[PDB]
DNA sequence: TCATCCCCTTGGCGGTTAAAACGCGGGGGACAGCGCGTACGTGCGTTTAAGCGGTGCTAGAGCTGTCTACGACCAATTGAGCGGCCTCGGCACCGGGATTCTGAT
């Protein structure tokens, strides 16, 4: 099966993330 | 009342004051490499509290009338801070005595 190498979902993560401006905190605990 | 010398005073060319860039002795560790080290990256399995949609309960500011007294503005009254004057001393600078980390042994 496919495995990704620790670094790449990071970068991913942080282009989805920074390309989008929803809001990443719950609405109820917080 | 409407031309030479010459002593020397006004211009521009020469002197000391308080610390650091070269010039040198030099060494503690940043950089790059060796080498050991373990928390979770990613994927899986499993479980749940947030999401969406309602559903039912309940209060308190928005807004509208009623009543009101300290706030603003006016004539008298008045009191100590500012400017100024006079008095007074605390400690920075001097110099010496006592104290003290630090390198070399």
């Known amino acids: 099966p496919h495995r990704y190498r620790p670094g790449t979902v990071?970068?991913?993560?942080?282009?989805?993330?920074?390309k989008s401006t929803e809001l990443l905190i719950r609405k109820l605990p917080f």
């Open 10 to 18: 990071a970068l991913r993560e942080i282009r989805r993330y920074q």
